[PDB]
């Protein structure tokens, strides 16, 4: 009586149940694991807070309306302030982590709409100015708020044009990245497990984000007659196999 | 025959002949069998 | 290898063509799941689509130019093209970029090939024979200041001497600080409020300095340098969506404003053929 | 001293060679490789992942909407969409498949075309997708369409339908750039019965459509893509 | 091997020289069936009549020309021969055509050899040294528009760089969509009422683009390109009648009107020697 | 570096040679051969089929 | 010795030494013996 | 080859970090004598610092 | 005479090569080596000897 | 393969792979053990 459909994920002191899942994706078919010695470089023993950092943090909720263009969060940024995960983050020189991402959106059998939930490794954004204008730090570190693709261009911020993925590629091809759809008629959640993907064994958690999670409405939300025209979307994310190394004074970052 | 000492100096590599699209085409956690229902 | 097996009528409870794309998988459906097929063999291996093959041919990565002329009274050799640099790239000439940026991370040995040809746009009695010197004055390396500085001794610094009209070849292992080169980097060099963004932060590998070794003849001679790059021993990770809009800058993803629709509009209906 | 003779071609530079060259910086020492998920070995590995087709090409500036094929409730017998199968041009051209095919001169193989339905769960519909092999015109009505490769799709719990365009061909390779002799057919879709919405519901519903290549597929003779060009070298 | 065996007088009921040609056979009659012969050996193998040998020597297949000159103010490089194409053939220069068209279907590897020589028809101080670039901008491939377009980066597209006066060689497998190249094709590309006829429909393999890499000197330099083609690994099917009338077009069988009698008229009688 | 000497004829192009040359487009992949009746191997095979002689040349 | 990797790059092929004119000179359905009458 | 071995807390009478430089020696002290380390390998031979290489171009 | 083809790079001088060259003065005869204390093999050997740092740079 | 007769004409030497800093880092007459007191 197991269905692909019902699932339970327990991680730390927190549990999620979905009764309307559509399997789960594990990026590149690899599950998060700690850093092996053969791959290690820094000689420091690392710190593995385990259950105090590897639990589920639910970010603040978004509201899908007929005019929504899509939202974008960066990792580990989105979690920069969650509990002890965040403290560890500002206090060590280097850290490394994988995540379980669970995006939630329920409706009824009269609604229609379909969101794309995708994880993009190394999502370098484009400046809407063109040329070689850079995208300032603050703009690519929105924190739990994430970036709202239907917000206005700002100065020093990225471009927010959806048919171009914020980088000069077409929305249609985002499907080459680990992703899952939430089609109100099928699905009510999306779950993706992200292994740590980098060109170095461990890195800085503040100067470099290693994935952007993106939720994009593709088939517009259509509510039943005289229904309220909107649904909330909630994102809950859990660091998994986290390791921190090179402890010290506590980083100070712009803004 | 390599005439040179360093590995960078050798010619192109030879075909992976690796080929396994499943990391890209089927990264699902619970295995899906073709023919069985997608969602049970 | 069979490309298609023989398959006949079906009347089952087992439907391989109905799936749920919401899952993120592309189910491996074949012609024989939905029509009646006959056996056929592949006769093919997929040899020429190997990434080593795809990135393994020489591509032009840079065209620069230097001239041989009397430096007498020149206050700025660099500025007179008495010598000239090239901030090592591989993302300036877009033809090989799209190719490369089809991948996130990528590791490959290298084989550089330099063609140099001369031009004599104004009245010369003859064509002189010039020898070019090409050098690697990287990060810490004293940069040439004049076309005949102590720098050009380059006794610790690699440097090539070939003739204009000829070609200079050589190869190089992966000299990238990390395990792979980042084709993309969503980071900064530090948490500064105004520091630059992209990969322009990482792609650190000094520049190439070219110069003519010859002193000047009575006429002036323009020498134009073309650098070709061939990846050998390629390794690529994490495929990405291909580049759709035009490029504007080395190392940023930025596209031009008021660009044009990249998807061709139908001449007719959705229903049109 | 061993006697030699040099042949025609000596001194040429062919950008498509694979010979040895000295190592500029010897005794160097690369940085070790660490493990990174996601390694690609063949472009054939990636063109099997499906991506969305902007089938609804009828707009005037690129929009998220050209990915949506609309469906109308209560129409009978009528046609949902049509397209030829020049995978290197037209709707296909910006898709990952289209985009890679363009790096090669010839292609052969089967294509997989699937449609995922997004209408309310309490609605229902039966569509017919038809592949018309080279030699006939794009079908003009379902009767015409139904006599070639087709699948009646019944919209249900299982949200997507995967149609295969089996390789139908005299010549074993076709050109990726559209060519007549080498042309591959048409793909059309019609109401089999009709879309029906539940009460309290209204308007258009949309289908999303994807394209990917079967394991069947072959691409050969690499060349340059018409999809990218430039007028001056970029700088930093 | 015996070329003739010894044979003596015959008075038989078994007549090998009477046959019925209406049958379509050529009965294998020998000298020894009708005169008295002596033994003789062949001393010969028929080596130099092998089709590999017959089609295996280089033949000139194309002569084109490009010039190096100041492109300043040229509105159409292609038109100024600032660069130039060649719609790959093998049926333009008739000497190798007749040879090839002796066969219906034919399959053979290839080995191209390009000679480039320069001419300076009007007053120059000297002869410059130019490097030619030869490229394959086939079906889908961006065609060069100017002599220095992004196209010439050719980073996925094969291209040769050699010096004028020298020669550029290389070879190529059978890149023909079908199992053999059709020397003839009695068909159309589709059932259109006005579409073209011949093999001009099939022989699709883009063109070759040549250009000089050098910028301009003070004088102008004419470079004339000659492409030679040698078949290697030849396979030929279905022999046909040799070409009798002159050729008029690449790819059609058409002969010129009011052509001349191709059979030599006797100077004398049927009875004449 | 192995010492060599080049002989007379170096650099010449003889259209009647049979030496090796690089492959412009590597890792390519030809199309398979199918069977076709009629293969010719030697011109000596075909000159044994008889054909008509315009003997009456007097026109 | 081939110095190159691809087969197209090898020199000319070597003599068929096949030679069988009968597909061209005697494509008759019922075999004709020299010396026996052509038409019986 | 290990570049660093794994080493944990220490509370000893054996102090490798106190020396007398007046002796003229450079005592071979390592990270693992004064912090807690994890194993890591060298992955490197020191090829390009050989004097033959240094004076050989 | 053995057929050859020369590749791109022929005739170049790369100051970072390691090939053979003839001996200008053959049958010479070096002077024997005697023992000398102090041989260095790697620069890695010497950067492990400590030296003083002008830390007080303020002059 | 050496093509030449004299030893000077051969290419560069090959890595010492000798490496022993103690003549430079620990030339003390009485051996010092790390961890034992420097001056007893
Ligand atoms: C002329 O002699 C040289 C001696 C050594 C050299 O090394 C060059 C190393 C640069 C590799 C660049 C690869 N890359 C750069 C950015 N992405 C990929 C060079 Cl380029 C030249
Ligand atoms: C210059 O580099 C090249 C790289 C690849 C090339 O391939 C050419 C293939 C054309 C074969 C033509 C054979 N043919 C054409 C019609 N009948 C016979 C060519 Cl021609 C040149």
**Which tokens is D55 given?**
């089938």
C88 close to ligand 1 (CB < 6 Angstrom)? yes
Length of chain I: 59
- How far from chain centre, in Å, is Cα A55? 15
Pairing of strands E181-182, C181-182: unpaired
Q: How far is it, in rounded angstroms, from Cα D199 to Cα D201?
A: 5
**Which tokens is E153 given?**
């980066």
Of I15, I16, I44, the CB nearest to H49: I44
Give the residue extent of every domain in chain D.
1-236
3-state secondary structure of E247: coil
Q: How far is it, in rounded angstroms, from Cα D116 to Cα D69?
A: 10
Task: Give the residue, by CA position, lying nearest to ligand 2 atom 6.
Answer: E136
Alpha-helical segments (H) within chain D: 43-46, 96-101, 142-146
**Which tokens is E12 given?**
């038989």
Q: What is the CATH number of the domain that holds C59?
A: 2.60.120.20
**Which tokens is E238 given?**
């279905």
CA distances from D181 to D92, D107, D130, E266, I24 (A): 20, 14, 21, 48, 69
Give the count of alpha carbons within 13 A of C119, CB side only.
Answer: 16
Q: How far is it, in rounded angstroms, from Cα E180 to Cα A252?
A: 71
Q: Is D208's CB within 8 Å of A114's CB?
A: yes
Give the count of alpha carbons within 13 A of D206, CB side only.
Answer: 21
Give the residue extent of every domain in chain A.
1-255
Cβ atoms of A182 and C21 within 8 Å: the answer is no
Residue I26 CB coordination number (10 Å) = 11
Cβ pairs C/F, distance under 8 A:
15
User: E: neighbours with 3+ CB pairs under 8 Å?
Assistant: C, D, F, G
Cβ atoms of I46 and J27 within 8 Å: the answer is no
Structure determined by: X-ray
- Chain I: give the shortest CA distance to residue J39, in Å: 19
C175 close to ligand 1 (CB < 6 Angstrom)? yes
Residue H22 CB coordination number (10 Å) = 8
User: D1-236 domain in CATH 2.60.120.20?
Assistant: yes
3-state secondary structure of D15: coil
Give the count of alpha carbons within 13 A of E9, CB side only.
Answer: 1
Q: How far is it, in rounded angstroms, from Cα E258 to Cα D135?
A: 40
C160 close to ligand 1 (CB < 6 Angstrom)? yes
Length of chain J: 40
Q: How far is it, in rounded angstroms, from Cα A128 to Cα J31?
A: 68
**Which tokens is E172 given?**
């190529």
**b/e sequence E90-111, b meaning 16+ C-beta within 10 Å:** bbbbeebbeebbbbbbbbbbbb
Cβ atoms of A245 and A202 within 8 Å: the answer is yes
**b/e sequence A173-194, b meaning 16+ C-beta within 10 Å:** bbbbbbbbbbbbbbbbbbbbbb
Contacts of residue E258, defined as CB under 8 A and 6 or more positions apart, other chains included, come to: none
Of all residues in chain C, the one with the smallest CA distance to F25 is C48
Q: How far is it, in rounded angstroms, from Cα E81 to Cα E220?
A: 12
CA distances from J12 to A23, D25, D128 (A): 61, 14, 74
Cβ atoms of B23 and D49 within 8 Å: the answer is no
What CATH code would you report for A1-255?
Answer: 2.60.120.20
> DSSP class of residue A166?
T
User: Is C260 near chain A, with CB under 8 Å?
Assistant: no
Contacts of residue C222, defined as CB under 8 A and 6 or more positions apart, other chains included, come to: C65, C67, C118, C119, C120, C121, E215
List the domain range (segments joined by +) for residue J30. 1-40
Of all residues in chain G, the one with the smallest CA distance to F42 is G19
E160 close to ligand 2 (CB < 6 Angstrom)? yes
Total domain count, chain B: 1
* Residue with tokens 């910028």, as numbered in its chain: E215
Q: Contacts by D30-33 with C-beta closer than 8 Å and gap 24+?
A: D30/C173, D30/C174, D30/C175, D31/C174, D31/C176, D31/C177, D31/C178, D31/C179, D31/H43, D32/C179, D32/H43, D33/C107, D33/C179, D33/C180, D33/C235
Alpha-helical segments (H) within chain B: 22-25
Q: How far is it, in rounded angstroms, from Cα C60 to Cα A239?
A: 44
Q: What is the CATH number of the domain that holds J15?
A: 4.10.80.10
Q: Chain F contacts of G10, Cβ < 8 Å?
A: 20
**Which tokens is D76 given?**
């009978």
Of D25, D27, D28, the CB nearest to H50: D27
Contacts of residue C84, defined as CB under 8 A and 6 or more positions apart, other chains included, come to: C64, C65, C66, C78, C209, C210, C211
Closest CA to E67 of E173, E199, E224, E182: E224
Secondary structure element (H or E) that encloses residue I46, with its range? helix I43-46
Total domain count, chain E: 1
Which of E84, E91, E136 to probe ligand 2 with, by most ligand atoms within 8 A of CB? E136
Q: Which of A222, A223, A225, A231 to mutate to test the interface with D (most CBs of D within 10 A)?
A: A222
Give the count of alpha carbons within 13 A of E106, CB side only.
Answer: 25
Cβ atoms of C38 and D208 within 8 Å: the answer is no
3-state secondary structure of D214: coil
Contacts of residue E144, defined as CB under 8 A and 6 or more positions apart, other chains included, come to: E77, E78, E83, E135, E137, E151, E152, E209, E211
């Amino acid at each position: 009586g197991y269905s692909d459909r019902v699932q339970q994920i327990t991680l730390g002191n927190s549990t999620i149940t979905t009764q309307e899942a559509a399997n789960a994706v594990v990026c590149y078919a690899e599950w998060p694991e700690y850093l092996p010695d053969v791959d290690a470089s820094d000689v420091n023993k690392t710190s593995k807070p385990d259950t105090s950092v590897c639990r589920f943090y639910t970010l603040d909720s978004k509201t899908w309306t007929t005019g929504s263009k899509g939202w974008c969060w960066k990792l580990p940024d989105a979690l920069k302030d969650m509990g002890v995960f965040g403290q560890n983050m500002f206090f060590h020189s280097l850290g490394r982590s994988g995540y379980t991402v669970h995006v939630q959106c329920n409706a009824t059998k009269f609604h229609s709409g379909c969101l794309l939930v995708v994880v993009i490794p190394e999502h370098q954004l484009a400046s809407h100015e063109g040329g070689n204008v850079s995208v300032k730090y603050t703009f690519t570190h929105p924190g739990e708020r994430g970036i709202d693709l239907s917000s206005a261009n700002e100065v020093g911020g990225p471009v927010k044009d959806v048919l171009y993925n914020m980088n000069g590629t077409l929305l249609g091809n985002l499907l080459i990245f680990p992703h899952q759809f939430i089609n109100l008629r099928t699905n009510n959640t999306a779950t993706i497990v992200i292994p740590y993907i980098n060109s170095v064994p461990i890195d800085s958690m503040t100067r470099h984000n290693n994935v952007s999670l993106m939720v994009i409405p593709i088939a517009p939300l259509t509510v039943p007659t005289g229904a309220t025209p909107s649904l909330p979307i909630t994102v809950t994310i859990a660091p998994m196999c986290t390791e921190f190394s090179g402890i010290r004074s506590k980083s100070i970052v712009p803004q | 025959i390599n005439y040179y000492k360093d590995a960078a100096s050798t010619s192109s590599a030879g075909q992976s002949l690796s080929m396994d699209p499943s990391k890209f085409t089927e990264p699902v956690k619970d295995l899906m069998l073709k023919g069985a229902p997608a969602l049970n | 290898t069979v490309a298609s097996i023989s398959s006949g009528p079906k009347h089952t409870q087992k439907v391989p063509i109905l799936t749920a794309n919401e899952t993120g998988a592309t189910m491996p459906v074949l012609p024989s799941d939905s029509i009646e097929t006959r056996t056929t063999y592949m006769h093919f291996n997929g040899s020429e689509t190997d990434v080593e093959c795809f990135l393994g041919r020489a591509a032009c990565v840079h065209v620069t130019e230097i001239q041989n002329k009397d430096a007498t009274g020149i206050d700025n050799h660099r500025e007179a093209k008495l010598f000239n640099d090239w901030k090592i790239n591989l993302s300036s000439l877009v033809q090989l970029r799209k190719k490369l940026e089809l991948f996130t991370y990528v590791r490959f040995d290298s084989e550089y090939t330099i063609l140099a040809t001369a031009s004599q746009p104004d009245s010369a009695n003859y064509s002189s024979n010039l020898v070019v010197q090409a050098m690697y004055v990287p990060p810490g390396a004293p940069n040439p200041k004049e076309w005949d500085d102590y720098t050009w001794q380059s006794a610790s610094n690699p440097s090539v001497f070939f003739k204009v009209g000829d070609t200079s070849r050589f190869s190089v292992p992966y000299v990238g600080l990390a395990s792979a080169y980042n084709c993309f980097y969503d980071g900064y060099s530090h948490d500064d409020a105004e520091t630059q963004y992209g990969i322009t932060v990482l792609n650190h590998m000094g520049s190439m300095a070219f110069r003519i070794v010859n002193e000047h003849d009575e006429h002036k001679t323009l020498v134009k340098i073309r650098v070709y790059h061939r990846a050998k021993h390629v390794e690529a990770w994490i495929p990405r969506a291909p580049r759709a809009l035009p490029y504007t800058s080395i190392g940023r993803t930025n596209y031009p404003k008021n660009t044009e629709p990249v998807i061709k509009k139908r001449k007719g209906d959705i229903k049109s053929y | 001293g061993l006697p030699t003779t040099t042949l025609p071609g000596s001194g040429q530079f062919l950008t498509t060679d694979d010979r040895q060259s000295p190592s500029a910086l010897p005794n160097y020492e690369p940085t070790p490789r660490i493990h990174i998920p996601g390694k690609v070995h063949n472009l054939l590995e990636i063109i099997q992942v499906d991506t969305l087709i902007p089938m609804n090409n009828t707009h005037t500036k690129d929009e998220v909407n050209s990915y949506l094929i609309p469906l109308n409730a209560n129409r009978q017998n009528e046609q949902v969409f049509g397209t030829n199968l020049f995978i290197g041009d037209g709707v296909f051209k910006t898709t990952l498949l289209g985009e890679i095919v363009q790096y090669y001169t010839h292609w052969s193989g089967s294509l997989r075309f699937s449609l995922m339905y997004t209408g309310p769960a309490l609605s229902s519909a039966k569509l017919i997708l038809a592949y018309t092999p080279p030699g006939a015109r794009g079908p003009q009505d379902r009767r015409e369409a139904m006599l070639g490769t087709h699948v009646v799709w019944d919209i249900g719990l299982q949200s997507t339908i995967v149609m295969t365009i089996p390789w139908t061909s005299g010549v074993q390779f076709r050109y990726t750039d559209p060519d007549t002799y080498t042309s591959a057919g048409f793909l059309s879709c019609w109401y089999q019965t009709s879309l029906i919405l539940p009460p309290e519901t209204t308007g258009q519903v949309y289908l999303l459509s994807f394209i990917s290549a079967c394991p069947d597929f072959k691409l050969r003779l690499m060349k340059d893509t018409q999809t990218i060009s430039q007028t001056v070298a970029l700088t930093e």
